[PDB]
Coordinates of C-alpha atoms and ligand atoms in Angstrom, one line a residue:
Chain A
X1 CA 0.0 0.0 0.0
X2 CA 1.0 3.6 -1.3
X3 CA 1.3 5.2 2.4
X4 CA -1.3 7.8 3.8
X5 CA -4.1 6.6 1.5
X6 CA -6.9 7.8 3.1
X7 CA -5.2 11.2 3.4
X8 CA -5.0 11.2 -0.6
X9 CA -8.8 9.9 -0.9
X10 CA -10.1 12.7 1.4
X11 CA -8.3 15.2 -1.0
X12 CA -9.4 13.2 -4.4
X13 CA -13.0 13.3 -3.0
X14 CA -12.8 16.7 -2.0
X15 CA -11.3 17.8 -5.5
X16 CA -14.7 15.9 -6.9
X17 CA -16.9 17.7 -4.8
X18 CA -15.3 21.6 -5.7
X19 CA -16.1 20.4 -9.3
X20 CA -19.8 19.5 -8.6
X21 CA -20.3 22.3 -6.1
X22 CA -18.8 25.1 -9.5
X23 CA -21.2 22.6 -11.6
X24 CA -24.1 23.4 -9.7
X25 CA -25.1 26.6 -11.4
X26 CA -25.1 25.1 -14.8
X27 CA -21.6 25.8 -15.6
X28 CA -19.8 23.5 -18.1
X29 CA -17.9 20.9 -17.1
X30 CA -15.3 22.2 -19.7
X31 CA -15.6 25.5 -18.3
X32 CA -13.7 24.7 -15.1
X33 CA -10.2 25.7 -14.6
X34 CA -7.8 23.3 -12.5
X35 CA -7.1 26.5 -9.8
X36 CA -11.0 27.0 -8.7
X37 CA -10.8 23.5 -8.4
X38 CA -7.7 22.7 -6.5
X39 CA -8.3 26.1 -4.3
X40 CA -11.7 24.8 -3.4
X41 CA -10.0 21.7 -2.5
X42 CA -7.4 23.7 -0.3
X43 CA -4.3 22.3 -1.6
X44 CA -1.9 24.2 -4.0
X45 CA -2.2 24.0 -8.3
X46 CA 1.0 21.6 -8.5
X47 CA -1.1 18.9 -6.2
X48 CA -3.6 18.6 -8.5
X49 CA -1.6 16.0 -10.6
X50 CA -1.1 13.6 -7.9
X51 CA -4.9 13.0 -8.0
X52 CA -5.3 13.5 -11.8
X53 CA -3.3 14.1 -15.2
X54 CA -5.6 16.6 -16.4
X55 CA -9.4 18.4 -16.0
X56 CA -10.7 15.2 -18.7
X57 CA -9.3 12.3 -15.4
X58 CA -10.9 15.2 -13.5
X59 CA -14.6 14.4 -15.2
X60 CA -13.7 10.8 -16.3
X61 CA -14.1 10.0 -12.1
X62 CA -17.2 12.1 -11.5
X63 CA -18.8 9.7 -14.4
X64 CA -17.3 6.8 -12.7
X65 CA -18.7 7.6 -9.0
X66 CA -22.7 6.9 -10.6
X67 CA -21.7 3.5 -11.6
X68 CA -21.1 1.7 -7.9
X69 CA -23.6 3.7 -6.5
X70 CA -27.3 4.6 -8.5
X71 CA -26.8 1.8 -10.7
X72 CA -26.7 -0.8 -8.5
X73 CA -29.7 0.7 -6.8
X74 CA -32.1 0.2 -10.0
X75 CA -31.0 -3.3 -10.2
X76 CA -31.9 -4.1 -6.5
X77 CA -35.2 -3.4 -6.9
X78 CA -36.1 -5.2 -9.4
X79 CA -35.8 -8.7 -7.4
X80 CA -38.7 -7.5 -5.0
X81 CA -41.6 -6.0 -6.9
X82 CA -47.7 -2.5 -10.8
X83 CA -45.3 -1.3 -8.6
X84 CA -41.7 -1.7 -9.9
X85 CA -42.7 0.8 -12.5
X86 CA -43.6 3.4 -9.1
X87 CA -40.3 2.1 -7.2
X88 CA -37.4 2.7 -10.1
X89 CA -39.7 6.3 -11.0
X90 CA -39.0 6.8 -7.0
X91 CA -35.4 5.6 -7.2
X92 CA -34.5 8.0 -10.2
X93 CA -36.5 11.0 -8.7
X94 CA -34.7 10.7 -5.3
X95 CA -31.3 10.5 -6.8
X96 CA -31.9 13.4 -8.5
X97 CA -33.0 15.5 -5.6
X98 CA -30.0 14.1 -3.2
X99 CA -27.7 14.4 -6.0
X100 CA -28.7 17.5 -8.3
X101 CA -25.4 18.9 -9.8
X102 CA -24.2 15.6 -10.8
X103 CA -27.3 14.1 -13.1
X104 CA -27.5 17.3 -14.9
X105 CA -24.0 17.2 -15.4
X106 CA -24.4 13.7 -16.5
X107 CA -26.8 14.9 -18.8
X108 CA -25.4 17.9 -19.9
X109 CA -21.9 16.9 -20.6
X110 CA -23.2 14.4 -23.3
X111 CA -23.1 17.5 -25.4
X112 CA -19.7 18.6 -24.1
X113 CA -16.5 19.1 -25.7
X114 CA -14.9 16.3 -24.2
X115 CA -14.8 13.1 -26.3
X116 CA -13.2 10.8 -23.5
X117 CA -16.3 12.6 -21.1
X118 CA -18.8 11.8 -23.9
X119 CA -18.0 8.1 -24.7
X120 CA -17.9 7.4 -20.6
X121 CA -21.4 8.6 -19.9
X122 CA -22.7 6.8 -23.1
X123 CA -21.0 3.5 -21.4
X124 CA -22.3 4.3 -18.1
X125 CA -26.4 4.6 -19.7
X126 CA -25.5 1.6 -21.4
X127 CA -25.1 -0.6 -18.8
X128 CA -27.8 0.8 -17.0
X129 CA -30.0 0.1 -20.2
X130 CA -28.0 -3.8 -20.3
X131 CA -28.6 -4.8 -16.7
X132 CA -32.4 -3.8 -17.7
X133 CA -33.0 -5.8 -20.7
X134 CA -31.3 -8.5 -19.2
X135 CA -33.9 -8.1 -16.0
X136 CA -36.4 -8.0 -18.3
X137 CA -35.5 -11.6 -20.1
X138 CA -35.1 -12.8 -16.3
X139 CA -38.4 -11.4 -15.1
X140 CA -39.9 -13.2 -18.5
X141 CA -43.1 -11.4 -19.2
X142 CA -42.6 -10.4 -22.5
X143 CA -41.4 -14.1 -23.7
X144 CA -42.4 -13.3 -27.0
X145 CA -39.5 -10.4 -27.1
X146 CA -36.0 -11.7 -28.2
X147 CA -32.6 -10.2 -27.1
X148 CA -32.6 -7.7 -30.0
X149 CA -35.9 -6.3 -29.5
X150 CA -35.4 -5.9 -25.4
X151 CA -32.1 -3.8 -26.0
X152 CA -34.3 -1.3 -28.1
X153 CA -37.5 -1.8 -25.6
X154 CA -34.6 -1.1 -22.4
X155 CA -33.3 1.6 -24.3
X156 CA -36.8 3.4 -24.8
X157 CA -37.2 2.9 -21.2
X158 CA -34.0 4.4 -19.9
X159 CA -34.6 7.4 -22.2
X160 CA -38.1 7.8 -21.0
X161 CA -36.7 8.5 -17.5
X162 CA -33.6 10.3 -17.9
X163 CA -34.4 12.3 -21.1
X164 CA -37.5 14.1 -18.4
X165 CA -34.6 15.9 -16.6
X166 CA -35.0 18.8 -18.3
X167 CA -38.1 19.5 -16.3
X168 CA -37.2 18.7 -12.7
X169 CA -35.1 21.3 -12.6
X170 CA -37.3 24.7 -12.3
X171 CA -40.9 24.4 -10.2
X172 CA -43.5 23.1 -12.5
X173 CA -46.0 26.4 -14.2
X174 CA -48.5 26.2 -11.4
X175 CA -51.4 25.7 -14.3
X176 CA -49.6 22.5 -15.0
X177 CA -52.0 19.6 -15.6
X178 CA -51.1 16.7 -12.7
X179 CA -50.9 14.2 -15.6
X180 CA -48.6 16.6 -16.9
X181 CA -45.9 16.5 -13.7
X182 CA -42.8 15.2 -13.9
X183 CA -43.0 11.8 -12.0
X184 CA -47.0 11.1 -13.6
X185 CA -45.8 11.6 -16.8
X186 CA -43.1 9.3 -17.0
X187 CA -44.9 7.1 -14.8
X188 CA -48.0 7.0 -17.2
X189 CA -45.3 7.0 -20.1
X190 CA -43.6 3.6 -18.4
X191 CA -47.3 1.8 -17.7
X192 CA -48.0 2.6 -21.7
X193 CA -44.2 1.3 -22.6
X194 CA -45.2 -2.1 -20.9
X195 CA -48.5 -2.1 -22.0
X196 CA -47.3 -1.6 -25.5
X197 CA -44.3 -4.6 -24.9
X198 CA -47.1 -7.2 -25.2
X199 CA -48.9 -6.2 -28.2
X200 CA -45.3 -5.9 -30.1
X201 CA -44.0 -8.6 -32.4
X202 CA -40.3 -7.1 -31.6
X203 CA -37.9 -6.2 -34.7
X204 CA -38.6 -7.0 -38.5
Chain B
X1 CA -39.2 52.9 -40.6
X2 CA -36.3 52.4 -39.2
X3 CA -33.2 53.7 -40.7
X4 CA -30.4 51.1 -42.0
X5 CA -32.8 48.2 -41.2
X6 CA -31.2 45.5 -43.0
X7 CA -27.6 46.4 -42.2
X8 CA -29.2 46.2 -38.5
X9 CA -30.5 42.4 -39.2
X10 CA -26.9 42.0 -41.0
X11 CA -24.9 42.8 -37.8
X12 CA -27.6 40.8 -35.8
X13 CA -27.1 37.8 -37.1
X14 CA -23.2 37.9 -37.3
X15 CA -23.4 38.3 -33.2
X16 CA -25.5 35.2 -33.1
X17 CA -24.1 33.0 -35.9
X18 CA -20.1 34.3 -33.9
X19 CA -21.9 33.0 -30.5
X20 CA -22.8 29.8 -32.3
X21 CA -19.4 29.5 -33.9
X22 CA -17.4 29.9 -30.7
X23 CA -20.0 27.0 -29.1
X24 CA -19.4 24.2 -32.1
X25 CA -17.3 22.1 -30.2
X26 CA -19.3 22.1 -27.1
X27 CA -18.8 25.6 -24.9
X28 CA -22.1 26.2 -23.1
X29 CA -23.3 29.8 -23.9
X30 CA -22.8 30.9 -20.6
X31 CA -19.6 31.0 -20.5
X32 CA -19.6 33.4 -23.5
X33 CA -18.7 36.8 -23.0
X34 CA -19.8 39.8 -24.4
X35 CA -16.5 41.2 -26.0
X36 CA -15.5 37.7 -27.6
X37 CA -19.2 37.5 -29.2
X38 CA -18.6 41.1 -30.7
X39 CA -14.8 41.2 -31.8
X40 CA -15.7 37.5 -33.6
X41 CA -18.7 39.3 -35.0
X42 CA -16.0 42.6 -36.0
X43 CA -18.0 44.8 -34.1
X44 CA -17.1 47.6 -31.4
X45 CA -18.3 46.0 -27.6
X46 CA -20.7 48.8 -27.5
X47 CA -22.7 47.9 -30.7
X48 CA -23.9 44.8 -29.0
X49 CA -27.0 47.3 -27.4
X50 CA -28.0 48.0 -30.3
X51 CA -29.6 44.3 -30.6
X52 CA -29.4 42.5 -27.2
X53 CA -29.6 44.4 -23.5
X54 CA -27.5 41.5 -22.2
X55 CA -26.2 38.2 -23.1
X56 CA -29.6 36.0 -22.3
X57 CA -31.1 38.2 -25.3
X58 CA -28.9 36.7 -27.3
X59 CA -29.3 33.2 -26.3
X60 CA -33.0 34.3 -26.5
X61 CA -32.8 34.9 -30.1
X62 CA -30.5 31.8 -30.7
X63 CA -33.8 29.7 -29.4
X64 CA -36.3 31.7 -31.6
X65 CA -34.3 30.6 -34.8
X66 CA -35.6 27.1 -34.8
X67 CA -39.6 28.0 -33.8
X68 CA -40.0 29.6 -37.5
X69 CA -37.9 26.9 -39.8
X70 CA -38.0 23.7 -38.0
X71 CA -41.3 23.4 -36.6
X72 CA -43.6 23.9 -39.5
X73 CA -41.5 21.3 -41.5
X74 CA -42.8 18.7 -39.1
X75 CA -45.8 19.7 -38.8
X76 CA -45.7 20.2 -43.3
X77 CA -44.8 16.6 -43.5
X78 CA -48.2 15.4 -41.7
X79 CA -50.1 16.5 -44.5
X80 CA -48.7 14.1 -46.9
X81 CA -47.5 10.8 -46.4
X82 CA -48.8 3.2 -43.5
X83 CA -45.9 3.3 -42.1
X84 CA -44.2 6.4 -44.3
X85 CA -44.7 9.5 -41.7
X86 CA -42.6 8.1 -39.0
X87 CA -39.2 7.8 -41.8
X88 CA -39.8 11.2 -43.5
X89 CA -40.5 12.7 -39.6
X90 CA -37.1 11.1 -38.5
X91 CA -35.4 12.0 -41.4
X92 CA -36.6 15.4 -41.3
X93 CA -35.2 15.5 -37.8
X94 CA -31.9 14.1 -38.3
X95 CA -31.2 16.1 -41.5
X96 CA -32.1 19.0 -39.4
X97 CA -29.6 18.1 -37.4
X98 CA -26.8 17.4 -40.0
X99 CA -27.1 20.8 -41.7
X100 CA -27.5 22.7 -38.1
X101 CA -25.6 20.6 -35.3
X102 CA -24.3 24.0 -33.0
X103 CA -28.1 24.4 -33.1
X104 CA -29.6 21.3 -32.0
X105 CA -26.5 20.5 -29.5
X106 CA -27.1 24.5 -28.1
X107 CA -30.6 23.4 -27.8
X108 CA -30.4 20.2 -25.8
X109 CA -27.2 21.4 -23.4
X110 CA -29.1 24.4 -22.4
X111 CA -31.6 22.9 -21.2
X112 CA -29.2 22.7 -18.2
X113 CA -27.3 25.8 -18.2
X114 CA -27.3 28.6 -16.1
X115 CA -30.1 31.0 -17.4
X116 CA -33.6 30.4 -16.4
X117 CA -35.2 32.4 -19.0
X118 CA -33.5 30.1 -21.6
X119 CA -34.6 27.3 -20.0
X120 CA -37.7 28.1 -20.3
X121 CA -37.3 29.8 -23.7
X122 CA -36.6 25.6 -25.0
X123 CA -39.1 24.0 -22.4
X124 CA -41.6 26.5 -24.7
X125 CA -40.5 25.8 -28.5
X126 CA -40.1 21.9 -27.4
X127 CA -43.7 22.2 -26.1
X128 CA -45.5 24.1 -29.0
X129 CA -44.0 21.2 -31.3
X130 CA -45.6 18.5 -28.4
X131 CA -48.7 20.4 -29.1
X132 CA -48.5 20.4 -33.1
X133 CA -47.9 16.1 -32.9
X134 CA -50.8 16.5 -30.4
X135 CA -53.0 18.3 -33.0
X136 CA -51.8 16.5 -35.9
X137 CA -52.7 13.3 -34.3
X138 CA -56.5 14.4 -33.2
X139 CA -56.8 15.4 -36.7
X140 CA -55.7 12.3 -38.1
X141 CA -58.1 10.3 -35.4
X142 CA -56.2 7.1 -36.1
X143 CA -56.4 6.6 -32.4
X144 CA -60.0 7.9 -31.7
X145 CA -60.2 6.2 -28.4
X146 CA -57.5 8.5 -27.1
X147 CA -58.8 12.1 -25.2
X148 CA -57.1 15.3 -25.3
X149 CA -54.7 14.9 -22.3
X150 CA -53.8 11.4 -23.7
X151 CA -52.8 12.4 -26.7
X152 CA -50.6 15.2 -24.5
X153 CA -48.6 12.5 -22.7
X154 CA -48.2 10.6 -25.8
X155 CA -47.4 13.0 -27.8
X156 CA -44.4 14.7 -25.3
X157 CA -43.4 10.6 -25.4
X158 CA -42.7 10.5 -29.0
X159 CA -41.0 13.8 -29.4
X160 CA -39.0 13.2 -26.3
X161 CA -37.7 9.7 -28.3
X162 CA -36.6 11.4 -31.2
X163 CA -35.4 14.9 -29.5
X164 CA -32.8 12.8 -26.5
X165 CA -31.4 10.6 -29.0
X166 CA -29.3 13.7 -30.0
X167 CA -26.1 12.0 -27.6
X168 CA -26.2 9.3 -30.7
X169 CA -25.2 11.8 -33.1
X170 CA -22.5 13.6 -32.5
X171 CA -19.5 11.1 -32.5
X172 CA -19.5 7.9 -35.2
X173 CA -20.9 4.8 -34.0
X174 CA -18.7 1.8 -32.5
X175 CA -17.6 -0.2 -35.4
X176 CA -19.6 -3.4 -33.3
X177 CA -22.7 -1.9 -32.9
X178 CA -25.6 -3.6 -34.1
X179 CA -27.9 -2.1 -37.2
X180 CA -30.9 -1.8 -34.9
X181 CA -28.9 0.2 -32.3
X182 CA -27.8 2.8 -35.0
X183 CA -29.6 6.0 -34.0
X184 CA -32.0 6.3 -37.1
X185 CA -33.1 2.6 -37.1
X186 CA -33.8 2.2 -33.2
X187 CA -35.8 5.9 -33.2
X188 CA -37.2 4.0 -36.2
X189 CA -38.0 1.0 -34.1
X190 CA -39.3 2.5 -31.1
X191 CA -41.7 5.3 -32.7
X192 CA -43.1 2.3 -34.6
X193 CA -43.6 0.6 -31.4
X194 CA -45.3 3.5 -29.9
X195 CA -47.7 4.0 -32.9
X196 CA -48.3 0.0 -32.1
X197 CA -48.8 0.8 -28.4
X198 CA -50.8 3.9 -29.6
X199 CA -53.5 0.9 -30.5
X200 CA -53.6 -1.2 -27.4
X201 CA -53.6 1.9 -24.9
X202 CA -57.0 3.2 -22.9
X203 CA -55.4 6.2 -22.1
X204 CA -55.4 7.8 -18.4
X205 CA -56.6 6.4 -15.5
Ligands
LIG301 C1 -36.5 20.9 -29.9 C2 -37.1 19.5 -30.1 C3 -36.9 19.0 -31.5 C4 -37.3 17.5 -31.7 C5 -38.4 17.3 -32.7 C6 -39.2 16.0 -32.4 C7 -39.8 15.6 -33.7 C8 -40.8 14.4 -33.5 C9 -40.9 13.5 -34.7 C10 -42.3 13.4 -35.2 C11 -42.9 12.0 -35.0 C12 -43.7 11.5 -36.1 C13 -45.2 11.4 -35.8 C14 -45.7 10.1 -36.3 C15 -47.1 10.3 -36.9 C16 -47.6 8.9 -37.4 O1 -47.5 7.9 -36.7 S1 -48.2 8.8 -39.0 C17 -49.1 7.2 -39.0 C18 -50.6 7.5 -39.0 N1 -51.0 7.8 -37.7 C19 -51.6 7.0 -36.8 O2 -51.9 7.3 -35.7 C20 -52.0 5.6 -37.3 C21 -51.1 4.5 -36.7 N2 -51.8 3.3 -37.1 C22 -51.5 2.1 -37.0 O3 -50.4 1.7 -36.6 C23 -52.5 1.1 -37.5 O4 -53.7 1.3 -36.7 C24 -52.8 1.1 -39.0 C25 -53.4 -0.2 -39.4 C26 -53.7 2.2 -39.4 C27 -51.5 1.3 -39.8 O5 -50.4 0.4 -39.4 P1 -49.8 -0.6 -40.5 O6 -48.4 -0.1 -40.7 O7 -50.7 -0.8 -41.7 O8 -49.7 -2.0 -39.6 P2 -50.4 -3.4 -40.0 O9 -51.4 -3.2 -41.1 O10 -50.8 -4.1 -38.7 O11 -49.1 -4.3 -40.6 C28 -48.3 -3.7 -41.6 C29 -46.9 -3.3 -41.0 O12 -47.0 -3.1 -39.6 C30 -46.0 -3.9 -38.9 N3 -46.6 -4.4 -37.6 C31 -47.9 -4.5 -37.3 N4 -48.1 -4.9 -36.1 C32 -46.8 -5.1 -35.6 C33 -46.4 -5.5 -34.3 N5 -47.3 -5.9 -33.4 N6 -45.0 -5.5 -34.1 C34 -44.2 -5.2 -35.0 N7 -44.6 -4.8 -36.2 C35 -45.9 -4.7 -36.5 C36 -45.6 -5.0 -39.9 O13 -44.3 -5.4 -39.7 C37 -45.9 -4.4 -41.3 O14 -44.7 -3.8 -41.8 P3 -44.6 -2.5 -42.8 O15 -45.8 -2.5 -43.7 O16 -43.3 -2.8 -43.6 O17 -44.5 -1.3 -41.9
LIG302 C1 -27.4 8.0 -16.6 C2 -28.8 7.5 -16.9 C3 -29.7 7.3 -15.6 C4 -31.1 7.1 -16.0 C5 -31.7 5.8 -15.3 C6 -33.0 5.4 -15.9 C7 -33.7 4.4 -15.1 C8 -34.8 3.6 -15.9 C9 -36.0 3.3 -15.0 C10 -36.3 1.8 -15.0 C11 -37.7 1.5 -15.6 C12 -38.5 0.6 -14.6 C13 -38.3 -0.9 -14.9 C14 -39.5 -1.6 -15.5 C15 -39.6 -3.0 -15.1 C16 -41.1 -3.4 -15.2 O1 -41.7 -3.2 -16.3 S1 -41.8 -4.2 -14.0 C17 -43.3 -4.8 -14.6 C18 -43.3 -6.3 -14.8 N1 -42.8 -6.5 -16.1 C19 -43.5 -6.9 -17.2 O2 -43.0 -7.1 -18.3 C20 -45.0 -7.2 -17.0 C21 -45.9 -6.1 -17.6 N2 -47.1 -6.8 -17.8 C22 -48.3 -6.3 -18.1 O3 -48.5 -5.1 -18.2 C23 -49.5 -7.2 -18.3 O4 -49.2 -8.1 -19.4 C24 -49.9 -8.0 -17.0 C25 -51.4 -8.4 -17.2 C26 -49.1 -9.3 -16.8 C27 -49.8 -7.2 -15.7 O5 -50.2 -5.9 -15.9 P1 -51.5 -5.3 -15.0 O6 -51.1 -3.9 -14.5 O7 -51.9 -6.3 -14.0 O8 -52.6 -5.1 -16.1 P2 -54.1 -5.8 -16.2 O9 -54.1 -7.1 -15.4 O10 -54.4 -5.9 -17.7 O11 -55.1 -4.8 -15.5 C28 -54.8 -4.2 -14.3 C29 -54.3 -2.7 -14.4 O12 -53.8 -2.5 -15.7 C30 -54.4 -1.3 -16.3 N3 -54.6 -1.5 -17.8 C31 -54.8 -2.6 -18.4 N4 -54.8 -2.4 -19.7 C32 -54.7 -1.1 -19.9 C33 -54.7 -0.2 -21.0 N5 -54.8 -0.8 -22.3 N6 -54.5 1.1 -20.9 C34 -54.3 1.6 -19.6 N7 -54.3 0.9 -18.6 C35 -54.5 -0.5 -18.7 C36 -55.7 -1.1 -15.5 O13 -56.1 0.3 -15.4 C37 -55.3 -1.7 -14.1 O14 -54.8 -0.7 -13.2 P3 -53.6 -0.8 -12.2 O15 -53.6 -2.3 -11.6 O16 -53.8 0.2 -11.1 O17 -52.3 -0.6 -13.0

């Protein structure tokens, strides 16, 4: 073991954090300098690089962070659950609240000028979209539905959710129909998804 | 009438087509500032209050581009076309984005910036195109059984499929990816599963 480890992941984390906490205005990713981020982090510019090589590492570990912790949450409760539909709308809309800055940076950064940052959040909804379709073979109620056709049915799923982020950001227009809010809508949106799964004949 | 007028509209549109230059490979506009926005453009810092009060004007303006091309195309192709409006409607779109990527990209990463009113500005043009599909499909009545706020929620479904497939089409596709995962095949694939669902679906509880 490299000695004082913790020492170095308190100043990683921290490092992280003065990234989100600059994101949380709607700043760019790519828009950050390495000083407002190593100040923030209270150590001097030069030990930024015993942490990271550059700003892109920087971003590559805020992508990573979603992956041991959200994404193993959506696959948990699948095993227990109607109601799953209710539960992963729950589980999304939760994770979002507790964990603003970094979903819309997930989002937004899609559209950022990092490749590297691009590709790793692609990867990341991926696998969230994989352990799905492969739930949804497990849980078997769309036999009819081969491997192909669940990987487009998980993807339109996975959008339907995340792609709504957009407007849980700002307080709903208070003439907003309640089939209309945020969490009905994609909730009604999921209940028609499966509804429409056993009516479809999957790909040509 | 205002003097100069099309010289005006000239200068206008080299501030916003320089703001939409200096965001093509993936700045956010709020990091823009006003004096890189006008020396790109070739104008003196002061002549940018001659169009915008501030840089949300702007990105105002940048929005209110798409609301008089893009949007009656879609609905223009309604008019026409079993099984042939939802391939012209996605090629429509993703031609639309070939020709005008800053746009579309602007369009879809603002939608989490910093400025409220442009926020709001894209929740609005995204949701008077919702309303069109909404429209369109009463008027077709191909799902009769369907009411008004129905049609709402499945409208803002389809558009919402084609519009946040947009991450798909930036970069080239993975040499190993599958032909039904390319981005105009699966928003191909899952619009016609909708319009399938479309049938089988009572609506609202
Ligand atoms: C800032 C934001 C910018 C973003 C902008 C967003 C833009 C949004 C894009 C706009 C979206 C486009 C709107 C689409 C509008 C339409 O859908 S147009 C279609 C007319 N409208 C309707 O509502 C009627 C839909 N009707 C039906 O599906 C059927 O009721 C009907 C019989 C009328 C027509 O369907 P049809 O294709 O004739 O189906 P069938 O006769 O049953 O069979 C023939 C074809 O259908 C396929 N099929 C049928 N059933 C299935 C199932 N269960 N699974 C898979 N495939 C099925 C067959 O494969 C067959 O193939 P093909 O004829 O080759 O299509
Ligand atoms: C970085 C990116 C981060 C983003 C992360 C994104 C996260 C993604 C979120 C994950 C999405 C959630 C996972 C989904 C997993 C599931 O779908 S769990 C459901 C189990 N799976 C299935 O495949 C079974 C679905 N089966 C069915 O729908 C039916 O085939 C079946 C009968 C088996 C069960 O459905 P059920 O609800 O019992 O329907 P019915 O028995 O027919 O009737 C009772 C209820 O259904 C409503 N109903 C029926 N028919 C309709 C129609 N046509 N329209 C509207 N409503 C209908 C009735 O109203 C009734 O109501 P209720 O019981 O209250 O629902």
């Amino acid at each position: 073991a490299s000695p004082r480890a913790e020492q170095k992941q308190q100043t990683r984390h921290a490092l992280m954090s003065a990234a989100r906490h600059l994101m949380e205005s709607g700043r760019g990713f790519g828009s950050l300098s390495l000083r407002e981020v190593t100040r923030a982090a209270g150590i001097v510019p030069a030990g930024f690089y015993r942490h990271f090589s550059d700003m892109d590492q920087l971003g590559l570990a805020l992508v990573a962070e979603v992956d041991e912790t959200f994404r193993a949450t959506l696959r948990a409760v699948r095993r227990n659950e109607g109601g799953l539909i209710d539960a992963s709308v729950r589980i999304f809309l939760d994770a979002v609240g507790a964990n603003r800055s970094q979903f819309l940076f997930l989002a937004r950064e899609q559209y950022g000028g990092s490749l590297p940052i691009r590709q790793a959040i692609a990867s990341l909804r991926q696998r969230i979209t994989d352990d799905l379709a492969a739930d949804l073979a497990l849980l078997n109620k769309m036999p009819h539905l081969d491997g192909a056709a669940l990987d487009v049915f998980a993807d339109l799923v996975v959008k339907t959710v995340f792609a709504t982020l957009p407007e849980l950001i700002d307080p709903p227009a208070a003439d907003l129909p309640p089939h209309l809010m945020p969490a009905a809508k994609i909730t009604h949106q999921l209940r028609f998804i499966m509804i429409g799964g056993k009516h479809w004949h999957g790909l040509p």
